[PDB]
Amino acid sequence: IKEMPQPKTFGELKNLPLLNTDKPVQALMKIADELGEIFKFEAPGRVTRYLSSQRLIKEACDESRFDKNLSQALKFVRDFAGDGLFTSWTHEKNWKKAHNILLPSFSQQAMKGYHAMMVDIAVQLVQKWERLNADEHIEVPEDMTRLTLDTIGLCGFNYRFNSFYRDQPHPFITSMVRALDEAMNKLQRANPDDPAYDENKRQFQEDIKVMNDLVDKIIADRKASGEQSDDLLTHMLNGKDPETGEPLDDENIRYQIITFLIAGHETTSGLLSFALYFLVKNPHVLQKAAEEAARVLVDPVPSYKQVKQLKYVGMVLNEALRLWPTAPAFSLYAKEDTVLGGEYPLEKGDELMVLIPQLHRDKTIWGDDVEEFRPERFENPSAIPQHAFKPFGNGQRACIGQQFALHEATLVLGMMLKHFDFEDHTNYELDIKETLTLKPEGFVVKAKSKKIPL
Amino acid sequence: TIKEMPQPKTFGELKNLPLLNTDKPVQALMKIADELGEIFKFEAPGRVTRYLSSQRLIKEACDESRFDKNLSQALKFVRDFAGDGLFTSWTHEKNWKKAHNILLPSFSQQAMKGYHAMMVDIAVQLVQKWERLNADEHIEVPEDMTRLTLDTIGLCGFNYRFNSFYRDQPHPFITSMVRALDEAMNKLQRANPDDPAYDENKRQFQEDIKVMNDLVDKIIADRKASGEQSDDLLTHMLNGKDPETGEPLDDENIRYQIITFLIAGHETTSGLLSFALYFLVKNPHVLQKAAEEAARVLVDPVPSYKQVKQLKYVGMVLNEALRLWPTAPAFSLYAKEDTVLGGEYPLEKGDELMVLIPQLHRDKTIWGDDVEEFRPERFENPSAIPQHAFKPFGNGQRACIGQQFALHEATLVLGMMLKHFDFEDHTNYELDIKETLTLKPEGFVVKAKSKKIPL
Ligand SMILES: CCCCCCCCCCCC(=O)N[C@H]1CCOC1=O
Ligand SMILES: CCCCCCCCCCCC(=O)N[C@H]1CCOC1=O
């Protein structure tokens, strides 16, 4: 039985001021490097234990001993995401109901149905970049957000955000991003009631109204038209939980649409932005990926089967998720009194945080070269030990969108690498913006067309 | 027989100048023409011009033995950034005939076949934009038509993509161009242009000119350095030799031609397409006849050059839209010698005339009492039209060089719109005409219902 280390304290505020930074996850990664596989993090009224080793995280991922916790971050996100899939407790009736109704919409098989709509948005991205003039550059995260938001809008709800027809952000996306940012900002407030935050709270309620108004209109419009689109909204309006036999109520459907739009856009746009970052910084890897895209994507429009043949592109995406998993932590609570790793006694209800980027740098799993971008680590996926690679979380509370995201990102990155050569014309210095999700900020490139027609 | 011509209301020392203190000066001059008739004197401090509205007088003004193109006060202000380009040059300037001879073959059928592919590129972007609207959404007609015609001339002019359909706010170059045009038209009403109140306007104007020159001169220098040959006007202008002088255009004149063409595409063809769609949704029998022609002729996903030339009724629709709202609403002439207009109005050498095209096109002695009705069938027998009765492209050797270009673009685009969509005047839109250099509907919105025909 060992005492776990704890980072520097600030008297009565304990560790809370360590979160007073626009990059809290990167701060916690540096703390993990200094303190090791486990450390105590205390704020007034809460304790959590940050885990960084596969040795301890494999135990935390035992669903008989630990269940998903709503971290302080998710409790704040629940103010707009309600009891949607992401911000519901496993024991809430609406978690299992929504999970059972929506799971078949998100299988590898279901991806065949979404494919044509993913291509629609991917072709818009390629056409945008083909139409740039000499000496113009690409704003990578901005264009990846346009792509991932439009893809989930169209595939999920048959709704066109038409993000590529706008050079200033969609009003809905302004509110979504600011709502997420307010959730992260609430984490570091020593005094949440300080009048300095009154404007932030008024803006938060305005942003919630913007999101609700659009979503509730989409639900009402679909109900009024009677249209069957075989999209997520169709499945949610018509679907019945096999267990309870109940449908979702209109309120829960609204929270699911908000949840899908936010998670769908934020995480996947981060992945594509990090993937392109690593490719232009590792030109040997860019060349391997570009050769595969050129050899496999022989048709103007990729087919579903051709996307499944982009093996190296898939390894590139997994290696980007290893280094910068875009939803970089998940929280667990102990179901009963238990001992973690034969050394750390826990009481029923005790919180754990899995620090995914640190897990993914565990030298006992990956070897000494853990900072290197080497997609070949994933060439034999079976070689990866249990619970060593967790970019989609764990068990029944794992990402429902995993197949969706990886199909979209593989298709899009394949088309990008088929159609363009890329130049890191600014020698971009990685700047990772945190809004609970991670994405490169200020990342620009030049694309030179290979002049291959669509 | 010699008559004194009427004159609208005066403002003491300012004479008629305050009549132009409006954002709708052409519409103001049309109402003056309705009241005073075929000719009126318009005086400002230090200038006089005579506004003509009847075919009887305009047919005389179009006599090239007696009258030549004049730079109206408007064109003199535009010449600060359009220089001695084709539009703002005098007929007798060496660079007018030289540029005219070099550029005429850039509007040959062979050149038009090359421009067609680039027009289709932009037209498909417009159709895709409208196909991608959600059910609750409307089209901003003049906004989308301007996006289309600017992008078309940018691609056809110098192989440059404004990417107007990727933007809510204009390209920085277009912000400067539009503000430069606005400054030119605003200078028309200024009693004292030297008032220090206008120092800011003048500073902004010089900044806007630098923005336009810097972009255009860079594109010309880049093209010369690369040696790349495209299907664009810039290639024709870098390679062309005037058969008369044997000289090519110099890089400065090429820049003025590019600015001239970009202003033309942004301003004129977008107006025509917006007015044409206005008249179609207000006249559903005409919309149906045009849509039946589009459906019969445009049988391929991408229209061909030859298919567009078969859209005869769509062409009549565009001519009838130009009759009622000619988007370039005036041209100016000066007397080459002392002469008498219409056997009644003595003119001295140098005297200025303004042709008020929208009034000409409402001459009931030519068109009949149904003159306000939208009837494309008026253009079934064009030989019936008296001399100089229909002048939307101006007159003689100074007539629009882009006439074929603009009518091909507008026919292609209107044809594709009518093939792909049904239109609804969902607001019962009341025509409101915004004036810049040109006339365009303002606030015109419609809903499109897709006929779901693939591209
Ligand atoms: C509507 C669904 C929400 C979609 C995005 C949610 C991503 C949540 C990841 C939360 C990770 C997380 O808890 N981060 C905390 C830990 C302390 O500092 C932080 O920032
Ligand atoms: C370089 C310009 C290219 C194409 C522009 C064509 C439009 C030119 C028309 C100029 C009309 C014009 O001179 N209008 C005056 C008449 C009195 O008040 C006005 O507004």
**C-beta of A260 in contact with ligand 1 (< 6 A):** no
DSSP string, B110-170: HHHHHHHHHHHHHHHHHHHHHHT--TT--EEHHHHHHHHHHHHHHHHHHS----GGG-SS-
Which backbone phi and psi does A294 adopt, to 5 degrees?
A: -60, -45
> Which structure tokens are listed for A341?
């790793």
Which backbone phi and psi does B354 adopt, to 5 degrees?
A: -115, 125
In which element (H, E) is residue A439 found?
strand A437-440
β-pairing, A351-355 vs A46-51, is parallel
Residues forming a β-bridge with B331: B355
Residues forming a β-bridge with A344: A340
Amino acid at A59: E
- Nearest-angstrom CA–CA distance, A235 and B162: 42
- Nearest-angstrom CA–CA distance, A118 and A343: 48
Q: Mind spelling out the 3-state secondary structure of B249-313? A: CCHHHHHHHHHHHHHHHHHHHHHHHHHHHHHHHHCHHHHHHHHHHHHHHCCCCCCCHHHHHCCHH
3-class state of residue A144 by DSSP = helix
Q: Which residue has the tokens 């008026």?
A: B378
> Which structure tokens are listed for B272?
């025509």
> Which structure tokens are listed for B397?
């050797």
- Nearest-angstrom CA–CA distance, A42 and A261: 33
Amino acid at A180: L
- Nearest-angstrom CA–CA distance, B180 and B251: 22
DSSP string, B416-428: HHHHHEEEE-TT-
Report whether B421 contacts B450 (CB < 8 A). Answer: yes
The three-point CA angle A25-A29-A31 to 5° equals: 115
Q: Which residue has the tokens 């912000």?
A: B175
Residues forming a β-bridge with B356: B330
Among positive and negative, which fits the CA dihedral A386, A389, A393, A396? Answer: negative
Among positive and negative, which fits the CA dihedral B424, B427, B432, B433? Answer: negative
What torsion, rounded to 10 degrees, do the Cα atoms A14, A18, A19, A23 define? -170
Residue B328 CA to ligand 2 center (angstroms) comes to 6
Query: Which letter does DSSP use for residue A22 in this model?
Result: S
Report whether B423 contacts B447 (CB < 8 A). Answer: yes
- Nearest-angstrom CA–CA distance, A48 and A352: 5
Amino acid at A36: G
> Which structure tokens are listed for A350?
């005790």
- Nearest-angstrom CA–CA distance, B210 and A298: 46
User: Could you tell me which of A301, A282, A331 has the C-alpha nearest to residue A50?
Assistant: A331
What torsion, rounded to 10 degrees, do the Cα atoms B264, B360, B144, B315 define? -90
Overall domain count for chain B = 1
β-pairing, B47-52 vs B352-356, is parallel
- Nearest-angstrom CA–CA distance, B250 and B22: 39
Edge-to-edge, what's the strand order for the sheet holding B330-335? B39-44, B47-52, B352-356, B330-335, B67-70
- Nearest-angstrom CA–CA distance, A128 and A454: 12
Amino acid at A449: S
Name the minimum distance, in Å, from the CA of B163 to any CA of chain A: 7
Listed resolution, Å: 1.8
Which backbone phi and psi does B70 adopt, to 5 degrees?
A: -105, 145
- Nearest-angstrom CA–CA distance, B95 and B83: 10
Contact between A131 and B166 using a beta-carbon 8 Å cutoff: yes
- Does residue A223 sit at the B interface (CB-CB below 8 Å)? no
Report whether B374 contacts B286 (CB < 8 A). Answer: yes
User: Could you tell me which of B296, B302, B334 has the C-alpha nearest to residue B412?
Assistant: B302
Approach to solving: X-ray
**Measured between alpha carbons, how far is residue A452 from residues A127, A299, A418, A419 in Å?**
11, 10, 8, 6
3-class state of residue B58 by DSSP = helix
In which element (H, E) is residue A374 found?
none
Which backbone phi and psi does A94 adopt, to 5 degrees?
A: -70, -20
User: Could you tell me which of A329, A266, A254, A323 has the C-alpha nearest to residue A94?
Assistant: A254
- Nearest-angstrom CA–CA distance, B444 and B423: 13
What is the per-residue burial (b if ≥16 Cβ within 10 Å, else e) of B400-411? bbbebbbbbbbb
Residue span of the structural domain in which B247 resides: 1-455
Packing angle, helices B141-158 and B403-420, rounded to 10: 130
> Which structure tokens are listed for A362?
């565990």
Amino acid at A386: Q
3-class state of residue B67 by DSSP = strand
> Cβ atoms within 10 A of the Cβ of A450, count?
12
**Measured between alpha carbons, how far is residue A58 from residues A53, A379, B48, B281 in Å?**
8, 22, 91, 67
Amino acid at B445: V
β-pairing, B39-44 vs B67-70, is unpaired
Query: Which letter does DSSP use for residue A315 in this model?
Result: H
- Nearest-angstrom CA–CA distance, A318 and A391: 9
> Which structure tokens are listed for B17?
């100048």
> Count of residues for chain A?
454
- Nearest-angstrom CA–CA distance, A179 and A171: 12
> Count of residues for chain B?
455
- Nearest-angstrom CA–CA distance, A215 and A229: 17
Mutation to probe ligand 1, out of A18, A31, A49, A71 (largest number of atoms < 8 A from CB): A71
How many Cα neighbours within 13 Å face the side chain of A324? 28
Amino acid at A122: A
Residues forming a β-bridge with B324: none
DSSP string, A17-44: GGG-SS-HHHHHHHHHHHH-SEEEEEET
- Does residue A450 sit at the B interface (CB-CB below 8 Å)? no
- Nearest-angstrom CA–CA distance, A289 and A373: 13
Rg (CA), chain A: 22
3-class state of residue A444 by DSSP = strand
β-pairing, B339-341 vs B330-335, is unpaired
> Cβ atoms within 10 A of the Cβ of A294, count?
15
3-class state of residue A443 by DSSP = coil
- Nearest-angstrom CA–CA distance, A14 and B218: 60
- Does residue B229 sit at the A interface (CB-CB below 8 Å)? no
Query: Which letter does DSSP use for residue B199 in this model?
Result: H
CB contact set of A434 (below 8 Å; sequence gap of 6+): A22, A23, A24, A25, A26, A184
Amino acid at A8: K
User: Could you tell me which of A324, A354, A12 has the C-alpha nearest to residue A141?
Assistant: A324
β-pairing, A329-334 vs A66-69, is antiparallel
User: Could you tell me which of B129, B66, B101, B137 has the C-alpha nearest to residue B334?
Assistant: B66
Mutation to probe ligand 2, out of B24, B32, B72, B177 (largest number of atoms < 8 A from CB): B72
User: Could you tell me which of B388, B367, B389 has the C-alpha nearest to residue B378?
Assistant: B367
**C-beta of A25 in contact with ligand 1 (< 6 A):** yes
Contact between B134 and A225 using a beta-carbon 8 Å cutoff: no
CB contact set of B181 (below 8 Å; sequence gap of 6+): B78, B263, B267, B436, B437
- Nearest-angstrom CA–CA distance, B406 and B394: 14
A428 known ligand binder: no
B94 alpha carbon, distance to own chain's centre: 25
Among positive and negative, which fits the CA dihedral B164, B166, B168, B174? Answer: negative
Q: Which residue has the tokens 């078309």?
A: B152
3-class state of residue A353 by DSSP = strand
Q: Which residue has the tokens 């170059």?
A: B173
